Design an enzyme around this catalytic site. Sequence first.
Site, PDB file in Angstrom:
ATOM      1  N   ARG A  20     105.837  62.752 -43.303  1.00 44.03           N
ATOM      2  CA  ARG A  20     106.341  64.129 -43.397  1.00 44.03           C
ATOM      3  C   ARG A  20     107.041  64.371 -44.742  1.00 44.03           C
ATOM      4  O   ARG A  20     106.796  65.372 -45.419  1.00 44.03           O
ATOM      5  CB  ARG A  20     107.274  64.454 -42.223  1.00 44.03           C
ATOM      6  CG  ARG A  20     106.577  64.425 -40.852  1.00 44.03           C
ATOM      7  CD  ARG A  20     107.573  64.557 -39.703  1.00 44.03           C
ATOM      8  NE  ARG A  20     108.526  63.451 -39.698  1.00 44.03           N
ATOM      9  CZ  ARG A  20     109.657  63.428 -38.997  1.00 44.03           C
ATOM     10  NH1 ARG A  20     109.989  64.456 -38.230  1.00 44.03           N
ATOM     11  NH2 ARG A  20     110.460  62.374 -39.070  1.00 44.03           N
ATOM     12  N   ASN A  38     105.819  65.881 -36.443  1.00 40.94           N
ATOM     13  CA  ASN A  38     105.320  64.761 -35.639  1.00 40.94           C
ATOM     14  C   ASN A  38     105.079  65.235 -34.211  1.00 40.94           C
ATOM     15  O   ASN A  38     105.935  65.900 -33.636  1.00 40.94           O
ATOM     16  CB  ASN A  38     106.331  63.606 -35.600  1.00 40.94           C
ATOM     17  CG  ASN A  38     106.294  62.746 -36.840  1.00 40.94           C
ATOM     18  OD1 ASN A  38     105.344  62.803 -37.621  1.00 40.94           O
ATOM     19  ND2 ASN A  38     107.323  61.920 -37.021  1.00 40.94           N
TER      20      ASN A  38
END
Length: 95
Positions: A20, A38
């Site tokens: 990320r 996620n």
Amino acid sequence: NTLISADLEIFGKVQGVFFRKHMQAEAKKLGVVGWVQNTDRGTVQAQLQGPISKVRHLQEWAETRGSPKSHIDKANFNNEKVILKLDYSDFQIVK
């Protein structure tokens, strides 16, 4: 010029590996906005918006590069559409 919005989901060893953070860093350099997240299925989901060239660069990053410790098994892209203006002001990591 041409702005697009497009969804993605990346499969493999893609959580717990700064995916990320790295995706966000690349998006910000490219001028791509949207979000990354996620999932509870061990995948990474995102929505990308920006000039098609920049989105394509980030999509390539997501599918073939990722973060150093990630291993990408597969990348799915869908829901692409041409948009007249961006719905996001930057690229967020969201919970």
